[PDB]
Design a protein around this motif. Structure first.
Motif, mmCIF file in Angstrom:
data_model
loop_
_atom_site.group_PDB
_atom_site.id
_atom_site.type_symbol
_atom_site.label_atom_id
_atom_site.label_comp_id
_atom_site.label_asym_id
_atom_site.label_seq_id
_atom_site.Cartn_x
_atom_site.Cartn_y
_atom_site.Cartn_z
ATOM 1 N N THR A 1 -25.879 -11.820 -8.864
ATOM 2 C CA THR A 1 -24.739 -10.954 -8.724
ATOM 3 C C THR A 1 -23.526 -11.803 -8.430
ATOM 4 O O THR A 1 -22.417 -11.486 -8.922
ATOM 5 C CB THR A 1 -25.095 -10.099 -7.562
ATOM 6 N N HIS B 1 -27.146 -1.684 -10.024
ATOM 7 C CA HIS B 1 -25.753 -1.914 -10.027
ATOM 8 C C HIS B 1 -25.516 -2.214 -8.519
ATOM 9 O O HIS B 1 -25.836 -1.281 -7.788
ATOM 10 C CB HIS B 1 -24.932 -0.617 -10.388
ATOM 11 N N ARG C 1 -22.057 -14.343 -11.381
ATOM 12 C CA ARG C 1 -21.334 -13.462 -12.288
ATOM 13 C C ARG C 1 -20.047 -13.007 -11.664
ATOM 14 O O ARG C 1 -19.985 -12.764 -10.494
ATOM 15 C CB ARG C 1 -22.058 -12.077 -12.447
ATOM 16 N N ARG D 1 -31.032 -0.640 -14.566
ATOM 17 C CA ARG D 1 -30.167 -1.640 -13.989
ATOM 18 C C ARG D 1 -30.109 -1.294 -12.581
ATOM 19 O O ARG D 1 -30.203 -0.112 -12.162
ATOM 20 C CB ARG D 1 -28.713 -1.582 -14.581
ATOM 21 N N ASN E 1 -16.656 -8.772 -13.221
ATOM 22 C CA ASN E 1 -16.873 -7.946 -14.383
ATOM 23 C C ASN E 1 -18.185 -7.104 -14.305
ATOM 24 O O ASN E 1 -18.051 -5.884 -14.657
ATOM 25 C CB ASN E 1 -16.853 -8.685 -15.738
ATOM 26 N N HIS E 2 -19.265 -7.685 -13.813
ATOM 27 C CA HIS E 2 -20.534 -7.071 -13.700
ATOM 28 C C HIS E 2 -21.025 -7.608 -12.471
ATOM 29 O O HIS E 2 -21.135 -8.837 -12.284
ATOM 30 C CB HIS E 2 -21.319 -7.341 -14.968
ATOM 31 N N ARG E 3 -21.450 -6.653 -11.569
ATOM 32 C CA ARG E 3 -22.446 -6.912 -10.551
ATOM 33 C C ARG E 3 -23.702 -6.135 -10.840
ATOM 34 O O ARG E 3 -24.493 -5.848 -9.934
ATOM 35 C CB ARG E 3 -21.747 -6.389 -9.203
ATOM 36 N N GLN E 4 -23.857 -5.812 -12.153
ATOM 37 C CA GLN E 4 -24.943 -5.042 -12.633
ATOM 38 C C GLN E 4 -25.857 -6.093 -13.210
ATOM 39 O O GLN E 4 -25.364 -7.032 -13.866
ATOM 40 C CB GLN E 4 -24.541 -4.108 -13.756
#
Lengths: 37, 47, 195, 376, 128
Positions: free
Chosen positions: D281, D332, D284, D330, D287-290
């Motif tokens: 997480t 998130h 990255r 996912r 933009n994404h912590r998914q």
């Protein structure tokens, strides 16, 4: 007297007698401060 | 200090006793300086 | 002394543990300072006395005032195991001399040594020269160096004399038993008045 | 007659080494070089005391009384701290303590140490319960004052020895953390650091609280001094951080050695899984912590099914927060906790901050641009 | 900066006197005047507490450190910090706000007709 232990005590005691007066003066002055507040 | 206790004098030998009495005499001079100190705080307060 | 303001520097060290002066060197040094401070005021009420420390981060604890009581209160409390940074104690004492309630007095520092000094001889020689120019005179009382070996102070004193409001001088008291308080006999109450 | 020559003579016979120390002490005592007297006292006490030997009572009971209002508290205190740890005797320790504590002309500094001396005794008689209370009070005192570095480490080590004995790995982590950072060796035994360092790592793996694996490596203690047990210990820390079952698994001979790792094998697997998830997480940007379940499974090197339960337990405890969408598959992350303190991790933060500096500049110009005629 | 001048007694005298001019003016603590927060400040923080009821250390600068207020408020804290380092004494900041009493508000509002953060009078005011 004839004992050295007798002499040490006497010295301590003339000093306690003297400390007592200052301690009493220190207390009076300090009493006055608290009352002023 | 250790003044005003009999038990200390019996326990300690003469060498300590001469030394000790001498410290105890200097103590009065510092207590006179303390009296003079309180009087100042009081004067500041007085205004 | 006449129209003079003096700050007393108290030496908090680790060579004040000795009972060569009774009770403790430090407690004997409090007492030595206190009678000198009183003598000065009594002689000439035109005297003011202030207190500064070498101990800790160096600050002016109490300032110059006609009242000996203001200085005395702080003196007892300052940490017995303080720092023996001499040069920093002198500098702050110079800043306080500037700011008084009435300004007409000469600038003087009288300094106590409880110990041999830690900071180089070089540094003190210099400080003394600049300080001499601003016209603050440091008069040094010597028992403290002598405990281990002969006084470094005399060299700093010599550099200082030449320009001062009142003369600088070394007053010597044996570091053993004759008490700290014996300094009343040697003149520091009133300097040489010299040039 | 005289105080110090009689006591000193009885001691001189017991230790010929101390004979030189006593002649020097005698001279100084009389002269009233009390500053020297402390130093004279300091050299004797540290390893000799005559506390396995004899003649201790006559010298000490009197010395503490003599020192009581002349020679500084550093003299009085040095006798108790040293003797008590050697000793198993409460009587003798208790007598010495009462006298040491009391005020002296030069200062009051004995107190902090006095309490430390007491703690040691309770450990020695074998009172777990008695010890822990006293230890808590000193540890707190140390935390208050910054910069007393040596006393903090020396205390932390004695406290650690008590903890090892009762078995409280969870408690052990917390108190251990402190020794590792301030670390110093000026009186600390070599062997003691090795035992406490072993338990400290073991605790650290069990942790649900631990997100300071990176700190354990960074502290000099574990890295610099290695033994055969310590070789595995640092490795197991490494395996956690990376959070791979492959790195972790080779180390498995270790799992058998301690029952602590062997018993809570479930917590270990769950921990390595969760830590790897946090690193992804973190790597990255914003933009994404998914991350998908599939991606989490690959990092963890644990089955997809068990990963889904493990992630749920971590959520439940509250270590992590987020949502699980099992339609998408996912997890998130809404929220992520403070990560391991390594250098690389300091660097990860820079990447986002630097990027953010350039997007803000660009954007700031667009906001000024719109109706620039009127700001008034 | 380990050489400086300060008059401690002065703090005590001022406390009594300010009460006559307004009741809302008593010794709250001390002000520092920038540029950073120093080690040398910590020695005075200790001292201030005795003199004042417990004091606050507010740093009022002549130019903002951000773009808003030039003031920071601090409280001394002791905290364990680990990376190979021991327990540190530091100053932990607490956030500040603006606010005034009715007398102050009256003069500033009549005098103000400046551009401000926003006055509010148009849409365009809001973009600033």
């Amino acid at each position: 007297m004839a004992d050295p232990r007798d002499k040490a005590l006497q010295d301590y005691r003339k000093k306690l007698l003297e400390h007592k007066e200052i301690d009493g003066r220190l207390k009076e002055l300090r009493e006055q401060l608290k009352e002023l507040t | 200090e250790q003044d005003g206790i009999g038990e200390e004098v019996l326990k300690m030998s003469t060498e300590e006793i001469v030394q000790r009495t001498r410290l105890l005499d200097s103590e009065i001079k510092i207590m006179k300086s303390e009296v003079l100190r309180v009087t100042h705080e009081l004067q500041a307060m007085k205004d | 002394m006449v129209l003079e303001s003096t700050m007393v520097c108290v030496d908090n060290s680790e060579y004040m543990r000795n009972g060569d002066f009774l009770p403790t060197r430090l407690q004997a040094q409090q007492d030595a300072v206190n009678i000198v401070c009183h003598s000065k005021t009594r002689s000439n009420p035109e005297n003011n006395v202030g207190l500064i420390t070498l101990a800790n981060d160096c600050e002016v604890l109490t300032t110059l005032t006609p009242d000996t009581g203001r200085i005395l209160s702080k003196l007892h409390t300052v940490q017995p195991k303080g720092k023996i940074t001499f040069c920093t104690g002198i500098r702050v004492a110079h800043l306080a001399l500037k700011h008084r309630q009435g300004k007409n007095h000469k600038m003087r520092i009288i300094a106590f040594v409880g110990s041999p000094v830690e900071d180089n001889e070089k540094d003190l020689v210099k400080l003394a020269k600049r300080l001499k120019k601003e016209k603050v005179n440091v008069d040094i009382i010597n028992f403290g160096e002598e405990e281990v070996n002969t006084e470094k102070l005399t060299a700093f004193v010599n550099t200082l004399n030449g320009k001062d409001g009142t003369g600088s001088h070394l007053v010597t008291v044996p570091p053993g038993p004759s008490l700290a308080d014996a300094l009343i006999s040697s003149p520091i109450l009133a300097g040489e008045g010299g040039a | 007659m005289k105080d110090v020559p009689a006591f000193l003579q009885q001691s001189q016979s017991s230790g010929p080494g101390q004979a030189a120390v006593w002649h020097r002490l005698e001279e100084l005592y009389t002269k009233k070089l009390w500053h020297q007297l402390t130093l004279q006292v300091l050299d004797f006490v540290q390893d000799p005391c005559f506390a396995q030997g004899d003649g201790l009572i006559k010298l000490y009971e009197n010395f503490i009384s003599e020192f009581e209002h002349r020679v500084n508290p550093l003299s009085l205190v040095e006798i108790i701290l040293h003797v008590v740890r050697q000793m198993t005797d409460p009587n003798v320790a208790l007598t010495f303590l009462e006298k040491t504590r009391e005020k002296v002309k030069s200062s009051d500094e004995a107190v902090i140490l006095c309490k430390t001396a007491i703690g040691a005794l309770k450990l020695n008689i074998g009172d777990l319960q008695a010890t822990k209370e006293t230890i808590e009070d000193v540890e707190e005192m140390l935390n208050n004052l910054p910069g007393v570095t040596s006393v903090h480490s020396r205390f932390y080590d004695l406290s650690s020895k008590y903890y090892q004995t009762i078995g409280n790995h969870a408690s052990y982590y917390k108190d251990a953390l402190r020794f590792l950072g301030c670390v110093d060796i000026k009186d600390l035994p070599v062997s003691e650091q090795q035992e406490r360092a072993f338990t400290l790592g073991l605790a650290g793996l069990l942790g649900e609280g631990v997100f300071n694996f990176g700190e354990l490596l960074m502290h000099p203690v574990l890295e610099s001094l290695r033994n055969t047990d310590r070789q595995w210990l640092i490795d197991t820390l490494y395996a956690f951080n990376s959070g791979d079952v492959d790195r972790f698994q080779t180390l498995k001979s270790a799992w058998g050695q301690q029952p602590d790792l062997a018993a809570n094998e479930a917590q270990l697997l769950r921990k390595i899984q969760l830590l790897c998830l946090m690193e992804m997480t973190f790597t990255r940007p914003a933009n994404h912590r998914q991350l998908t379940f599939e991606e989490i499974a690959k990092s963890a090197k644990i089955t997809v099914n068990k990963v889904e339960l493990l992630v749920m337990k971590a959520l439940s405890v509250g270590l992590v927060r987020g949502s699980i969408d099992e339609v998408d598959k996912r997890v998130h992350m809404t929220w992520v906790q403070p990560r391991v303190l390594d250098l690389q991790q300091i660097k990860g933060m820079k990447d986002r901050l630097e990027l953010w500096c350039t997007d803000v500049k660009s954007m700031e110009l667009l906001v000024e641009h719109q109706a620039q005629d009127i700001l008034t | 900066d380990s050489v400086w001048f300060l008059d401690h007694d002065y703090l005590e005298n001022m406390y009594g006197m300010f009460k006559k001019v307004n009741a809302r003016e008593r010794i709250v603590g001390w002000y520092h005047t920038g540029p950073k927060l120093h080690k040398n400040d910590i020695a005075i923080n200790e001292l201030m507490k005795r003199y004042c009821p417990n004091s606050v250390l507010v740093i009022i600068d002549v130019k903002p450190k951000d773009l808003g207020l030039p003031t920071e408020a601090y409280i001394s804290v002791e905290e364990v910090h680990d990376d190979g380092t021991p327990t540190s004494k530091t100053f932990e900041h607490v956030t500040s706000e603006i606010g005034a009493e009715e007398a102050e508000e009256v003069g500033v509002e009549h005098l103000l007709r400046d551009i401000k953060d926003t006055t509010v009078g148009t849409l365009s005011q809001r973009i600033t």
